[PDB]
Amino acid sequence: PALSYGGDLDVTQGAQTLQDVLTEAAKTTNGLTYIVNSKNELTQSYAQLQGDAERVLTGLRALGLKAGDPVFFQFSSNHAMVTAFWACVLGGFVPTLVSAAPTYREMNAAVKKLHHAWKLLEHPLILTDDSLIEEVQGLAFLWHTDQLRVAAVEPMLTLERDTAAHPAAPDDSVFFILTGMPKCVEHSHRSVLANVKGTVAANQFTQEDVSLDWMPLDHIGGIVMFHLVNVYTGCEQIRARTDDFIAQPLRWLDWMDRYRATKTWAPNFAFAMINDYEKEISSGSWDLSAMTCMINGAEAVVPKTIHRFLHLLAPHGLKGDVIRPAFGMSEISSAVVFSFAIERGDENSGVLTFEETSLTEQLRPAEARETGTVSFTELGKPIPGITIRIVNHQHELLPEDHIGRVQIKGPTTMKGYYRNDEANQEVFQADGWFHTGDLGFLHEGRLTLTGREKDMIHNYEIEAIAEEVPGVETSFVAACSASDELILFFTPKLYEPAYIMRASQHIKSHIATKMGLSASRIIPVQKKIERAQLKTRWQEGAAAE
Amino acid sequence: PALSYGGDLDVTQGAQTLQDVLTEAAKTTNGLTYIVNSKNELTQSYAQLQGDAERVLTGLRALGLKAGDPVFFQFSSNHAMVTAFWACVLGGFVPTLVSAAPTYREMNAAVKKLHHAWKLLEHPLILTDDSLIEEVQGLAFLWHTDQLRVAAVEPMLTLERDTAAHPAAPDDSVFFILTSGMPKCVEHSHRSVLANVKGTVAANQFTQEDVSLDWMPLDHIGGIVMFHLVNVYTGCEQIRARTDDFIAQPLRWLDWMDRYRATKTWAPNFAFAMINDYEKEISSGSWDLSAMTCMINGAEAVVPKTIHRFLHLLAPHGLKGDVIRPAFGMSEISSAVVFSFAIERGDENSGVLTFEETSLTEQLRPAEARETGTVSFTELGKPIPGITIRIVNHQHELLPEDHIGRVQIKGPTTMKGYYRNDEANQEVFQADGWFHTGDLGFLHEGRLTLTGREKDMIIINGKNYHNYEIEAIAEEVPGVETSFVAACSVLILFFTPKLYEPAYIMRASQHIKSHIATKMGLSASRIIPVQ
Ligand SMILES: CC(C)CC(=O)C(=O)OP(=O)(O)OC[C@H]1O[C@@H](n2cnc3c(N)ncnc32)[C@H](O)[C@@H]1O
Ligand SMILES: CC(C)CC(=O)C(=O)OP(=O)(O)OC[C@H]1O[C@@H](n2cnc3c(N)ncnc32)[C@H](O)[C@@H]1O
């Protein structure tokens, strides 16, 4: 059946709290390196991190923080945030990992979400940078509150070390992380370390790895899949600012080369962004021969994006098997599946193609064609300790090669959303099954995501019918919440105004007839040549936004 | 400012718990009449209601229910549901008011929402009809659970009367009701529900002589509170019909009003428009609607066209032209909190306010209705006694009158909160004791007028915008007569061209994307121009 177990995970081996992770890491000579620019870097050994964290701990306790208290992180500096995180670990304080707002001068969406979590956590101390404390302090006027408390981390780095680490238990909450209003994922040392240990075993991570990450530390893959995995293995890890990558994506290449990185990760959009620079890549020089692990996860992994990425960077020494698709969620401590089958020389390896007609039934393999076939990137087997299953509308187990609702069982699951019993019921189903909200199938024990529940009105059938209209070259439907309406994008064979209005009328009326919808339910939108796929360009727009 | 207090409401006056309400009602000879069909009915005096509720109480207590335990309601029959509700009041049990599922054979949205509530309430006994109990028991297979418990009301009607009522306190929970995503479980007390009853009775001057007619579901807050509980509190005669019977043949509404000489009734705006569809059948029928004095219209946007048409069409049948009363409320505030007494058949501008469509972002400017360039809204009236309404901007700052903003409510009718959801309770329970409704509107002369919902606003670059604000920028484009914009989630701007020609329409469509993308700093890809 569509139920895959990753095998036994011995979580008794190794550290049991994050304090023990930092202690064992501080015994190595490895640590962190924070990139400032192409020439300058700031180093912080794991031994220095421990002392720095103890210094910050002195200031936090001076502000009255007691073990169990939450701490609201609002950082632009990786150095200050990493240090602040471990100070909290030492003090038994619970960090709330959430990105800083794009601006603090007006009551925008990001600022509203921060207020919600801040109020849900009963007005916790906000910890931030010197470069942000002025902005963050403005929230006192935006929120019309006298309960705002802010403090910068850098001033604390000049304090005496507080060597009295609060004794933590594996089930103690280790941090909150934010996902409408965001929910407050509460994790323990046990759930995080279980993902770390599972991730290390599946990928064979070691203390000799060299890690490069520019993704936000407020993203679960930034904090757990990399930062904590790196400290747990005690390997060398290089941190870059997210802003610096999206400003100049080719810096990713420079960084992998300059530090001889062996592993890194990004969502699929970053790979597509690099592919947009083929001209300047074909006139550049990088040594990427040390890179062994480029994890691709957090959103849909597009086969043609990763293949082009491997092709473009092959002359620069990137082996064709470094890209590892992965899937995970903050609620399950980051990635729980990894695919080791993507190969530059085999576009079909680790990629599954099926007939569009069979999406609602037993999937029927096919050879990729211009139309009528869909290609999905396999995301691999569960890591040790994780069980995945695929279920139908009634939560009944499905067989393999059947698209259904993905559910996860294992030791990496959050304690739950903070202060929301009702939301915890929706996701925590009977017998330990966490409901992801994602759609996919299992094939040879390997998970493949195909969509989301919120992404439900079949869009392959709507597009096929739209393409029978003579004026339509190709089509793309997205659903859109007075009416539940589907917006039908199309390329006309001819971008002439009369021709477009004819095709638009036929699209509306031909879809209304063939599928028994109201013509009012279909909106036709007309859309040179672009090389980047449409699904890939929208990934880039939402990411850099 | 845009803040209106409805006046002081003496809550210490009158019954303080629903037990007291039924006891007083039972002293009258009035009660309920359940409509079976045109030629049949079942009657249940308030005294008989108390006795029937005492018998059901014997069955519920026989099932082990204790004071404070919830009870899941799944009813096709109003008589059984009303009796169950009061049996739970006598026993201190907390009914969970939710409509029956359209079908228990398949796993539809309704059944999922029931499981969520049922699970949230920790598997309460489900109380249902002997008619429906067969399908309800099917949830055991559909939900794949062995903890389901179901019982029928009717068999319990043969048991002895348990006259030992649990002593209730005003702040005890009196019932749960599900919101209309997954629904939330609104929890109310006798105090909050009775505060709304008392304010509503005072605003409308309801009395023991009213004759009430209601076909709306008792799982709707206006069905249980605004009418049923108001009617028991006033001790008046109330007629109950089944909701399906009305939808089957809407004109039965007129039949019932005529047959029972009803003085008050209610429905959402659609029901009035349903009747308007039947102009032909109404022109060849005969009703005496002269006793009707109060037709509440609420739960949806009140369309001036629909109500004024409705009034002209039933006037030959004796419907007075002032009977329709727009109203707004929410289950979280236990039903209506404003009533408008200004609608009139002979003056289609009374109780209605029209403005220049350009004055909507700042101080509204009154106007004379026009074919284009003006919008008109139905006033929903002053707060009932005890309620305070205010309008606020995106920073929760008070606004002046004639300004559109977020509507907030304060008063004694507010729920305890959403059951087992601290987070959602924070979102709606704002500082200074204000409840965030999620609706938009303005105050004018102390009267509330709604103009939209927050879920309808367009969010771009994390900033929020009204539909009309975008429309005014779109209007500036040459060749755009009028426009309407409706937010999209993956900006659908619908416009009328000055001249209907392909190239003329295509280029006005291009200047709408360029002019708005420029003025709002948005990606042209995000602007969809539809003619
Ligand atoms: C550490 C990373 C591997 C991922 C992660 O852990 C994360 O992304 O955490 P996040 O909570 O932020 O969001 C979770 C939601 O991202 C979606 N998602 C993640 N990976 C995906 C993939 N490979 N393909 C398609 N969709 C994917 C999914 O829908 C999921 O439920
Ligand atoms: C009159 C009461 C019995 C209605 C009621 O109490 C109810 O309708 O209960 P409900 O909680 O189910 O729904 C609440 C949501 O209905 C919307 N709503 C209600 N009345 C409205 C009106 N007059 N005009 C426009 N919208 C209205 C509003 O958005 C509100 O927040």
GROMACS .gro file of N, CA and C in nm, chain A residues 181 478 519:
model
    9
  181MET      N    1  -0.370   3.470   0.948
  181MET     CA    2  -0.270   3.491   1.052
  181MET      C    3  -0.184   3.365   1.067
  478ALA      N    4  -0.580   2.878  -1.295
  478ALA     CA    5  -0.570   2.883  -1.148
  478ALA      C    6  -0.710   2.909  -1.094
  519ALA      N    7  -2.097   2.995  -1.783
  519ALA     CA    8  -2.006   3.082  -1.861
  519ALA      C    9  -1.951   3.193  -1.770
   0.00000   0.00000   0.00000
